[PDB]
Amino acid sequence: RPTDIKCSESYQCFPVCKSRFGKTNGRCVNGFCDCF
């Protein structure tokens, strides 16, 4: 899902998502993290 976690780039999200939610990967949609 999309969040409100601000990001400039996708590789910023990926580890945050893996850490926090335990998701497989993350990607920066419209400057906000989308984890999946």
UniProtKB/Swiss-Prot annotation:
Name of this chain's protein: Potassium channel toxin gamma-KTx 2.1
GO cellular component term, pick one: extracellular region
Function per UniProt: Blocks human and/or rat Kv11.1/KCNH2/ERG1, Kv11.2/KCNH6/ERG2 and Kv11.3/KCNH7/ERG3 by binding to channel outer vestibule (S5P domain) with a 1:1 stoichiometry. Inhibition data are the following: hERG1 (reversible, Kd=7.7 nM, IC(50)=3.3 nM, IC(50)=11.9 nM), rERG1 (reversible, Kd=19 nM), hERG2 (reversible, Kd=77 nM), rERG2 (irreversible, Kd=4.2 nM), hERG3 (reversible, Kd=11.5 nM) and rERG3 (reversible, Kd=747 nM) potassium channels. Also has a minimal effect on rat ELK1/KCNH4 potassium channels (9% inhibition at 100 nM).
Source species of the chain: Mesobuthus eupeus
Mutagenesis / variant outcome for changing residue 20 to A: 70.6-fold decrease in affinity to Kv11/ERG potassium channels
Disulfide bonds: 7-28, 13-33, 17-35
Lineage: Eukaryota, Metazoa, Ecdysozoa, Arthropoda, Chelicerata
Result for mutant: residue 18 to A: 86.4-fold decrease in affinity to Kv11/ERG potassium channels
Result for mutant: residue 14 to A: 8.2-fold decrease in affinity to Kv11/ERG potassium channels
Site (Crucial for Kv11/ERG channel binding, plugs its side chain into the channel selectivity filter): 18
Keywords: Disulfide bond, Ion channel impairing toxin, Neurotoxin, Potassium channel impairing toxin, Secreted, Signal, Toxin, Voltage-gated potassium channel impairing toxin
Keyword Disulfide bond (UniProt): yes
Segment of the intact protein contained: 22 to 57 of 57
Effect of residue 32 to A: 1.4-fold decrease in affinity to ERG-potassium channels
Domain characteristics, as noted in the entry: Has the CSalpha/beta fold, which comprises one or two short alpha helices connected to anti-parallel beta-sheets stabilized by three or four disulfide bonds.
Note: The inhibition potency of the toxin for ERG1 decreases as temperature increases (IC(50)=7.6 nM and IC(50)=15.3 nM at room temperature and 37 degrees Celsius, respectively), likely due to changes in the structure of the channel binding site.
